[PDB]
Amino acid sequence: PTINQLVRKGREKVRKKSKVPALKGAPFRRGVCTVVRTVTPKKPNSALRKVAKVRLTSGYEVTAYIPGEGHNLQEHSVVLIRGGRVKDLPGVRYHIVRGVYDAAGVKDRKKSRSKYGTKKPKEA
Amino acid sequence: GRYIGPVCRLCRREGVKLYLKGERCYSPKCAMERRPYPPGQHGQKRARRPSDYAVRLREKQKLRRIYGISERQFRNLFEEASKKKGVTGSVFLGLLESRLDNVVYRLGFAVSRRQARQLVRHGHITVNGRRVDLPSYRVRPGDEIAVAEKSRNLELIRQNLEAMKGRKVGPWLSLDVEGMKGKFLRLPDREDLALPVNEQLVIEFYSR
Amino acid sequence: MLTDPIADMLTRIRNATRVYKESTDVPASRFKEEILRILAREGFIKGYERVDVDGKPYLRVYLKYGPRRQGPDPRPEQVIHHIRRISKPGRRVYVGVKEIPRVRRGLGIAILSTSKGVLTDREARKLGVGGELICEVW
Amino acid sequence: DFEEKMILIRRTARMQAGGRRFRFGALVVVGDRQGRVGLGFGKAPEVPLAVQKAGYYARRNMVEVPLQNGTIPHEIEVEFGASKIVLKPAAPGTGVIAGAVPRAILELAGVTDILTKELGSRNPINIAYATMEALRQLRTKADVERLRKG
Amino acid sequence: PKKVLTGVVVSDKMQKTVTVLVERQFPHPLYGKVIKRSKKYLAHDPEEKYKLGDVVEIIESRPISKRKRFRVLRLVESGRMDLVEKYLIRRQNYESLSK
RNA sequence: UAAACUCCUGAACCCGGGACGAAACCCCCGACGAGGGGACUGACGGUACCGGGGUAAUAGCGCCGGCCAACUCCGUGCCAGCAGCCGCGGUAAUACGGAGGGCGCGAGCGUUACCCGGAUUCACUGGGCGUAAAGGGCGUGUAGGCGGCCUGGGGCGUCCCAUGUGAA
RNA sequence: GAGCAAACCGGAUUAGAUACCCGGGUAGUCCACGCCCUAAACGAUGCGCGCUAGGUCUCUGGGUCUCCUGGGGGCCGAAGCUAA
RNA sequence: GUGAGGUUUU
Numbered sequence: 001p002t003i004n005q006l007v008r009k010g011r012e013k014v015r016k017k018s019k020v021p022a023l024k025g026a027p028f029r030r031g032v033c034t035v036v037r038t039v040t041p042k043k044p045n046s047a048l049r050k051v052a053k054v055r056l057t058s059g060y061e062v063t064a065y066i067p068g069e070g071h072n073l074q075e076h077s078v079v080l081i082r083g084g085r086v087k088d089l090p091g092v093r094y095h096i097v098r099g100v101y102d103a104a105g106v107k108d109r110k111k112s113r114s115k116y117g118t119k120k121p122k123e124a
Numbered sequence: 125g126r127y128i129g130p131v132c133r134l135c136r137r138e139g140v141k142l143y144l145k146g147e148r149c150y151s152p153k154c155a156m157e158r159r160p161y162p163p164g165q166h167g168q169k170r171a172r173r174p175s176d177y178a179v180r181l182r183e184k185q186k187l188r189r190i191y192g193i194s195e196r197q198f199r200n201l202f203e204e205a206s207k208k209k210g211v212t213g214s215v216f217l218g219l220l221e222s223r224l225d226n227v228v229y230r231l232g233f234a235v236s237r238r239q240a241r242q243l244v245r246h247g248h249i250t251v252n253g254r255r256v257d258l259p260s261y262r263v264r265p266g267d268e269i270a271v272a273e274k275s276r277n278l279e280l281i282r283q284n285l286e287a288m289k290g291r292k293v294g295p296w297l298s299l300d301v302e303g304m305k306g307k308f309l310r311l312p313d314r315e316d317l318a319l320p321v322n323e324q325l326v327i328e329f330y331s332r
Numbered sequence: 333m334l335t336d337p338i339a340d341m342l343t344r345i346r347n348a349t350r351v352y353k354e355s356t357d358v359p360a361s362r363f364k365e366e367i368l369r370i371l372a373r374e375g376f377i378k379g380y381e382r383v384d385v386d387g388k389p390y391l392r393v394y395l396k397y398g399p400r401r402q403g404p405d406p407r408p409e410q411v412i413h414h415i416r417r418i419s420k421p422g423r424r425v426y427v428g429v430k431e432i433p434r435v436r437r438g439l440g441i442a443i444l445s446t447s448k449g450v451l452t453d454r455e456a457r458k459l460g461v462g463g464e465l466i467c468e469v470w
Numbered sequence: 471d472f473e474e475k476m477i478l479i480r481r482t483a484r485m486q487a488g489g490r491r492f493r494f495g496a497l498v499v500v501g502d503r504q505g506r507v508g509l510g511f512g513k514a515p516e517v518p519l520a521v522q523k524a525g526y527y528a529r530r531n532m533v534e535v536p537l538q539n540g541t542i543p544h545e546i547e548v549e550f551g552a553s554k555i556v557l558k559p560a561a562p563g564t565g566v567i568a569g570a571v572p573r574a575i576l577e578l579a580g581v582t583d584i585l586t587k588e589l590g591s592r593n594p595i596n597i598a599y600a601t602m603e604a605l606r607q608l609r610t611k612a613d614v615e616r617l618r619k620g
Numbered sequence: 621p622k623k624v625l626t627g628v629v630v631s632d633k634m635q636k637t638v639t640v641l642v643e644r645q646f647p648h649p650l651y652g653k654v655i656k657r658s659k660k661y662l663a664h665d666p667e668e669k670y671k672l673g674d675v676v677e678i679i680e681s682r683p684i685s686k687r688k689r690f691r692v693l694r695l696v697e698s699g700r701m702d703l704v705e706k707y708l709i710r711r712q713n714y715e716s717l718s719k
Numbered sequence: 720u721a722a723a724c725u726c727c728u729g730a731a732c733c734c735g736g737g738a739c740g741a742a743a744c745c746c747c748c749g750a751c752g753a754g755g756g757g758a759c760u761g762a763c764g765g766u767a768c769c770g771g772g773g774u775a776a777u778a779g780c781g782c783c784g785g786c787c788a789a790c791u792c793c794g795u796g797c798c799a800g801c802a803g804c805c806g807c808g809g810u811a812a813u814a815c816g817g818a819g820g821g822c823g824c825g826a827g828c829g830u831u832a833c834c835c836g837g838a839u840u841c842a843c844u845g846g847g848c849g850u851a852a853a854g855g856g857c858g859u860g861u862a863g864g865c866g867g868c869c870u871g872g873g874g875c876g877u878c879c880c881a882u883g884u885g886a887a
Numbered sequence: 888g889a890g891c892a893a894a895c896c897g898g899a900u901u902a903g904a905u906a907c908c909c910g911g912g913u914a915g916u917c918c919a920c921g922c923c924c925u926a927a928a929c930g931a932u933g934c935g936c937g938c939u940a941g942g943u944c945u946c947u948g949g950g951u952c953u954c955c956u957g958g959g960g961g962c963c964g965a966a967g968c969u970a971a
Numbered sequence: 972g973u974g975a976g977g978u979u980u981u
């Protein structure tokens with residue numbers, strides 16, 4: 001506005017916050033899943049998608065998504081987390097990197113092969 | 125390691141005829157004859173207009189594919205090209221034409237860039253005894269360049285001065301065929317260094 | 333009050349050029365006197381003189397325009413395109429010898445205030461001075 | 471002997487009882503690279519009439535762009551409604567840095583080097599009319615010297 | 621090059637010293653506005669000649685207290701009690717903002 | 720031209736040689752200074768490098784509806800899934816998985832977290848307040864921000880010149 | 888405390904009146920007091936100054952009252968503004 | 972100067 005109001009009041013900072021609540025600025029964080037029950041999606045689409053509530057090492061317990069054609073998970077599983085968001089689920093804002101020692105990648109995967117974490121498909 | 129594979133593939137998608145093989149390019153077998161369409165089994169599709177990103181992308185290919193210097197090897201060249209004081213779209217062309225691939229090739233010691241890159245790369249073409257196995261050398265103005273004394277009587281160099289038995293190359297260089305050497309005199313300009321590339325729609329893409 | 337009579341005079345200029353007045357008035361001052369030989373020097377307005385209306389020291393402003401050319405908006409084009417005062421009381425503006433704006437690349441001009449009177453852009457680059465940037469016609 | 475490049479195709483609609491209709495409005499920029507440039511906005515229910523009719527709508531108007539050192543002579547700040555297009559000069563060989571629509575107009579008029587930027591809205595029609603309104607304010611030194619004869 | 625800065629006397633309620641604030645002008649480093657700020661510089665008065673409501677000159681010296689560094693060198697003018705009101709009315713305007 | 724094929728250079732590999740980095744400290748002559756001369760020392764390292772002989776000898780990653788570069792078939796039929804947004808998959812899915820092709824980069828390619836720009840989306844350059852968010856319900860009034868004309872002084876703010884300094 | 892009228896009691900309506908309609912009727916509406924702090928407290932337009940075509944209906948001070956010189960209350964409208 | 976027992980969303 002006026003210059004005297006710019007000296008007295010001053011402009012404000014926009015104060016954006018972290019969209020992911022994972023502490024310490026972590027790209028990845030080790031977690032343990034508890035129950036892998038499913039959640040129905042929003043209005044435009046319907047799919048019995050795979051979602052596991054994973055407690056972290058920082059004292060949190062979050063709602064995570066499993067990507068790929070199935071998974072290999074148990075109740076006492078160590079699940080490394082990635083983050084991001086899932087658009088058509090109400091509570092999910094985390095992804096799971098397949099390739100960690102309790103989450104191996106799905107076989108027959110050679111196009112998004114490094115994204116879904118599998119080794120080279122051996123020729124025969 | 126800049127690109128290894130099908131190299132006349134880039135001509136059919138590129139459009140205008142490119143000279144990167146030599147004896148196959150100047151002959152009427154450059155695969156531009158009888159096969160104009162871009163490669164792949166789509167090829168002669170409908171006449172869809174390329175987007176304005178795609179036109180300057182293909183202009184990035186007409187500046188990059190012929191010279192062979194890759195993209196991470198290329199952004200820095202545009203960076204000191206913009207750092208030099210003058211018309212950057214004209215200084216950049218001769219600035220890439222100050223390298224031992226196209227200085228040696230415009231001197232005519234090779235039939236294409238894949239002979240200049242390789243025969244300079246093994247370490248034969250020397251800058252006055254200081255042999256250089258490395259075509260990324262910036263050629264100074266007025267630099268005389270000769271081949272190795274063991275390379276003066278090879279089975280390929282004798283076929284690499286054959287067409288240039290006294291060829292009147294333009295004023296950005298000089299040459300001595302009977303001494304088998306040359307002298308890059310000064311940096312080439314925009315138009316008399318005549319290669320099929322456009323100037324205007326390049327800095328627009330590289331500033332974005 | 334007349335808190336800014338100088339911006340009021342520039343509002344006489346930019347207000348008179350939009351409504352096409354032949355002559356207009358401004359209350360007289362020795363600094364408003366000091367503005368006008370730049371405009372009459374570069375040909376923005378014709379002249380200025382000390383007049384008197386009802387016992388009040390005033391100043392006439394003689395505008396000029398171009399020829400009446402054909403086309404939409406047939407009223408002729410103005411000499412200035414407009415004027416915006418830089419030296420505000422709410423934000424004082426002081427420039428050095430190198431803090432000289434490029435006033436339309438060399439087409440318009442800015443009026444400055446130096447210790448050696450009122451002086452302009454090109455002779456500020458040649459003379460090497462600096463002061464309070466008054467205004468900028470472009 | 472112009473170039474006549476169409477750059478925008480808009481499919482409009484109006485509601486008739488039972489079913490809505492269509493009206494196609496294109497946007498044709500015409501030029502010859504020596505300063506002559508024109509703009510056309512057409513109204514036709516089908517595409518080649520939407521490009522041709524806007525072509526003649528680009529042909530019956532013409533405005534000459536003054537070219538000093540191959541580029542525009544001076545910087546301008548022009549407000550057409552909400553769109554605030556701002557053009558500036560450049561050095562020779564700098565580059566035609568523009569948005570989509572001045573990238574679609576100044577390369578038809580023939581500007582060698584432009585550094586421009588718009589503010590406010592992003593409507594290509596208002597950037598187009600803001601551009602054709604913007605380049606009419608371009609004057610050289612000579613037509614200001616012969617204008618200012620005091 | 622010890623600085624010689626002009627201040628104004630608003631209070632001499634404590635003996636052998638004076639409460640002197642110094643007004644000064646500086647533009648804002650971002651917005652660029654010449655605004656007048658002040659900061660009190662407690663000075664010693666060994667002669668007891670500078671009364672309440674003076675305009676004095678200030679030279680720095682060796683400190684005798686916590687939060688004392690300066691002393692009074694000279695008076696430029698005096699008697700302008702209106703500026704002493706221009707501080708002290710701000711002293712009796714702080715009580716209207718409390719619980 | 721991709722492959723095999725005629726020809727060539729032959730990275731790796733082997734053989735032999737071997738470095739600047741090192742002349743000082745230390746003595747001799749000389750007037751214990753000034754000056755000149757002589758002597759020792761390498762982890763790197765038998766390495767970088769030089770002279771030859773000599774084998775054609777690694778390649779993958781992400782994307783392909785629009786933003787943004789690049790499409791055909793098979794199976795899946797709101798399920799399996801993609802997903803930064805718009806949002807797709809209901810028997811022709813150019814949006815899923817696979818085959819092929821193409822695109823970008825290349826010993827690198829995608830993904831994540833953070834920061835800036837994009838964003839004029841805190842606007843000092845560079846925004847508004849009738850209807851999109853916005854004038855306090857209104858007035859007096861403290862501090863503050865300012866402020867009519869002319870003359871004279873101060874040179875505090877402002878401008879100019881040389882120097883200290885803004886280390887590396 | 889005359890009338891009206893929250894709450895509430897009955898008649899019709901409807902599955903339903905606790906509403907629109909009707910019959911009374913309670914604080915309240917009215918007066919002095921100390922308080923309370925609210926809105927479509929609107930012109931959804933902060934205050935003050937200066938400039939910028941006019942036409943049209945009235946209030947008000949003066950004249951040379953035919954018309955002009957100050958202020959204030961509405962409509963259209965030049966330039967200008969706005970996304971309209 | 973004059974008009975509605977009056978309605979619910981598929």
Ligand SMILES: [Mg+2]
Nearest residue numbers: 044045046797
């Ligand atoms: Mg659905």
Ligand SMILES: [Mg+2]
Nearest residue numbers: 128129130721
């Ligand atoms: Mg091959």
Ligand SMILES: [Mg+2]
Nearest residue numbers: 589590591592
């Ligand atoms: Mg916007």
Ligand SMILES: [Mg+2]
Nearest residue numbers: 129130720721
């Ligand atoms: Mg080959």
Ligand SMILES: [Mg+2]
Nearest residue numbers: 279725726727
């Ligand atoms: Mg052979």
Ligand SMILES: [Mg+2]
Nearest residue numbers: 727728729773
């Ligand atoms: Mg051999």
Ligand SMILES: [Mg+2]
Nearest residue numbers: 744745759760
């Ligand atoms: Mg020793």
Ligand SMILES: [Mg+2]
Nearest residue numbers: 746747748749
């Ligand atoms: Mg001895």
Ligand SMILES: [Mg+2]
Nearest residue numbers: 752753754755
């Ligand atoms: Mg010695």
Ligand SMILES: [Mg+2]
Nearest residue numbers: 754755756757
């Ligand atoms: Mg010695």
Ligand SMILES: [Mg+2]
Nearest residue numbers: 761762763764
């Ligand atoms: Mg050893």
Ligand SMILES: [Mg+2]
Nearest residue numbers: 761763764765
């Ligand atoms: Mg050794």
Ligand SMILES: [Mg+2]
Nearest residue numbers: 726727729775
């Ligand atoms: Mg071989």
Ligand SMILES: [Mg+2]
Nearest residue numbers: 175785787788
């Ligand atoms: Mg596309």
Ligand SMILES: [Mg+2]
Nearest residue numbers: 782783784814
């Ligand atoms: Mg996609």
Ligand SMILES: [Mg+2]
Nearest residue numbers: 835836837838
């Ligand atoms: Mg920015």
